[PDB]
Amino acid sequence: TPRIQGLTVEQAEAVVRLSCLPAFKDLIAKVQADEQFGIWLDSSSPEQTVPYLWSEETPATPIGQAIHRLLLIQAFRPDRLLAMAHMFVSTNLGESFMSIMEQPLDLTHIVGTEVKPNTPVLMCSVPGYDASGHVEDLAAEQNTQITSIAIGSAEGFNQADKAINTAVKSGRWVMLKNVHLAPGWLMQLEKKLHSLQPHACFRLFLTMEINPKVPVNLLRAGRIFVFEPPPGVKANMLRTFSSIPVSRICKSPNERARLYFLLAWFHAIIQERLRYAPLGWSKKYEFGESDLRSACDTVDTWLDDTAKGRQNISPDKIPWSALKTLMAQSIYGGRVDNEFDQRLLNTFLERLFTTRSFDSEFKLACKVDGHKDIQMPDGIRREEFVQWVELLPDTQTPSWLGLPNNAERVLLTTQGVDMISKML
């Protein structure tokens, strides 16, 4: 592994890792002859501007050029490997091959026609996301009665059996909540379903969170439907503001809405900071909806005790140290194991939760991309806050979190080496 100027040791190792094939015998010579090679290495999207580095004697096919680009990128810039696998499959299978999935999933016709009656609609949902909105939208759009139930008891078992016996003849779209908590009942449902003769309009939605306790034969005979919470600080804040009711945030005093906005921003920034582990947190915790609910109850009761029904209080009147200590030691620092992670949560709360965050000068996230800054909306109402989070920029660098801007890059290169291993 030599030290090529402009190439890292890993890049030279990957050059050796591909250099057993006659397309790139003199790839070191080609790279050292390419003057704009460093500029291309610094490019934001190098896939569309791959320089001519493959050497051959014949006019190569577009698939050959695409795989030459893939070879060179795994040599040099492995971060863009997933996006150029996207355009590589676009090269040899059409650009509209995956254009349905870089697009919100059209569930309606697919579940109405492409799903067998005897194959239940496996309603997979990652924890933290609830997909009952989709089945409610479907039920509203066909305008028929739907029995959405929660399976958590023997009475729930009996009602589920009665509803299944009704729906197997009525042809109904029936959703069964949190079925992953009863693996034995799920096994019973599957082994009955394999012998069932369902209606041509009857399908079962099995809303589950990711657990390895599910029946493998149900996964055999199931129409899997995996969703995710859409990535984005904006998406997390909109989800938080959709879950939080309007009355609770509009209730007096008028700084309660600002405190809830601070809570939503903090929860969104930590939850988005989970997905860039290990640099965000040293391990993946579960900052969930119950954690947000505990935080909301804490701030609600402490602000109620402080204000005692006052329609306005001073920015210095708010128990900032009380909320800081409750967050860091009981709400979100309880699951924190390492003291380094505890200190990190403390520094988040020191920056965010303070009395200095009620003026126009303060910034929610300093040095976004080194030059831009984000400032709080000065409105005092939930409508103004939700308008500010609607009108946020679509771009979201890791400096929004506080991670350096190359956090997305290191996540991409870890995803690329995982792509290599998973396809191996």
Side-chain angles (χ1 to χ4, degrees):
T1 303
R3 188 46 170 81
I4 296 94
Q5 177 60 67
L7 294 192
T8 80
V9 289
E10 298 93 8
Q11 289 165 17
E13 176 56 50
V15 160
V16 177
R17 191 181 280 178
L18 60 85
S19 75
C20 289
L21 296 168
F24 304 97
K25 294 284 98 175
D26 300 310
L27 189 48
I28 293 154
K30 297 148 203 171
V31 165
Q32 76 103 27
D34 202 23
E35 181 55 48
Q36 64 103 40
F37 195 85
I39 294 95
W40 164 79
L41 193 86
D42 282 27
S43 187
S44 66
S45 177
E47 51 264 19
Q48 299 300 111
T49 50
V50 177
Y52 175 69
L53 307 166
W54 50 93
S55 289
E56 76 285 328
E57 54 90 20
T58 180
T61 57
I63 181 60
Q65 305 284 265
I67 211 160
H68 290 147
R69 293 181 285 216
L70 198 67
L71 289 163
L72 294 157
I73 280 295
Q74 204 213 8
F76 306 137
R77 285 262 322 276
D79 64 323
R80 312 297 313 171
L81 206 71
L82 280 69
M84 66 184 67
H86 286 295
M87 55 70 78
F88 179 88
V89 181
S90 296
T91 296
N92 57 21
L93 280 164
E95 269 86 6
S96 67
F97 194 58
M98 59 184 66
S99 74
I100 189 71
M101 284 308 85
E102 292 166 271
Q103 188 270 330
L105 191 150
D106 190 18
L107 186 142
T108 307
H109 163 68
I110 288 168
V111 73
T113 318
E114 305 195 340
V115 174
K116 309 173 235 197
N118 76 314
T119 293
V121 193
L122 181 61
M123 209 67 266
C124 180
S125 291
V126 181
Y129 188 98
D130 205 359
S132 79
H134 308 261
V135 59
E136 282 291 331
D137 196 6
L138 177 58
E141 87 183 283
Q142 73 249 4
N143 263 350
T144 195
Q145 45 96 16
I146 170 172
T147 312
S148 160
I149 52 172
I151 295 179
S153 50
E155 281 88 8
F157 280 179
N158 298 325
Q159 295 312 291
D161 289 318
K162 172 61 63 185
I164 278 160
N165 196 13
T166 304
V168 76
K169 204 185 73 62
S170 86
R172 212 174 57 190
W173 297 95
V174 187
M175 194 264 287
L176 315 178
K177 281 201 171 299
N178 56 89
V179 290
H180 51 282
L181 313 169
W185 200 86
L186 198 42
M187 184 66 202
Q188 164 259 316
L189 175 48
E190 192 268 347
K191 71 206 198 213
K192 188 182 179 169
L193 177 142
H194 183 74
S195 187
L196 272 177
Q197 310 177 23
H199 196 261
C201 305
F202 158 65
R203 281 94 162 112
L204 290 174
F205 298 99
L206 279 301
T207 55
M208 58 83 72
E209 292 184 354
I210 296 304
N211 308 119
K213 307 168 65 178
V214 284
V216 176
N217 55 9
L218 183 63
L219 307 193
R220 292 273 83 82
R223 185 84 174 78
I224 318 168
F225 268 115
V226 163
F227 317 124
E228 270 190 90
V233 183
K234 277 77 56 180
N236 285 14
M237 298 209 49
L238 264 300
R239 200 178 307 120
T240 300
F241 274 102
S242 294
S243 46
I244 288 175
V246 62
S247 58
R248 191 180 185 185
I249 189 165
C250 86
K251 198 46 193 170
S252 311
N254 316 319
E255 304 94 4
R256 190 193 285 200
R258 172 63 84 107
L259 273 187
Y260 288 172
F261 169 76
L262 282 166
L263 187 139
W265 173 263
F266 169 69
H267 174 84
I269 211 74
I270 60 170
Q271 190 174 359
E272 294 282 291
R273 205 180 156 107
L274 288 177
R275 288 171 24 223
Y276 294 174
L279 206 79
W281 295 98
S282 83
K283 77 180 92 188
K284 278 213 176 218
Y285 309 99
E286 287 184 357
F287 305 145
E289 192 275 332
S290 178
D291 221 344
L292 186 144
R293 177 72 54 91
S294 289
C296 272
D297 288 329
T298 284
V299 65
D300 182 32
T301 315
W302 280 74
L303 186 63
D304 272 321
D305 267 1
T306 296
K308 306 144 196 310
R310 261 191 301 280
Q311 303 306 102
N312 194 288
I313 62 176
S314 161
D316 285 326
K317 202 173 272 190
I318 284 178
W320 290 106
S321 184
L323 271 299
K324 267 196 298 182
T325 302
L326 266 293
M327 287 287 141
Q329 318 288 277
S330 160
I331 310 300
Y332 289 104
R335 316 170 181 271
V336 165
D337 296 358
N338 284 317
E339 65 95 14
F340 289 96
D341 304 333
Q342 189 40 63
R343 192 189 60 243
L344 165 69
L345 197 40
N346 263 314
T347 54
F348 284 118
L349 292 154
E350 268 177 34
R351 290 284 188 98
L352 263 292
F353 269 100
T354 192
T355 192
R356 214 190 168 271
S357 191
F358 269 51
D359 57 7
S360 66
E361 181 66 27
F362 192 53
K363 332 168 183 288
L364 278 186
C366 295
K367 54 176 71 68
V368 170
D369 285 336
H371 64 279
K372 200 174 65 177
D373 315 310
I374 306 297
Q375 294 141 352
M376 309 91 79
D378 265 355
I380 58 157
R381 266 311 302 263
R382 182 224 187 202
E383 287 92 7
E384 293 139 356
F385 279 115
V386 73
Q387 285 321 113
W388 186 83
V389 303
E390 283 283 333
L391 274 298
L392 270 163
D394 183 76
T395 185
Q396 191 263 317
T397 45
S399 289
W400 273 37
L401 315 178
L403 283 79
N405 274 326
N406 69 334
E408 190 77 278
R409 174 171 70 189
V410 302
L411 180 83
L412 287 203
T413 190
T414 306
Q415 279 171 355
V417 296
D418 209 356
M419 166 61 108
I420 298 153
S421 66
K422 275 181 288 178
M423 177 283 268
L424 177 56

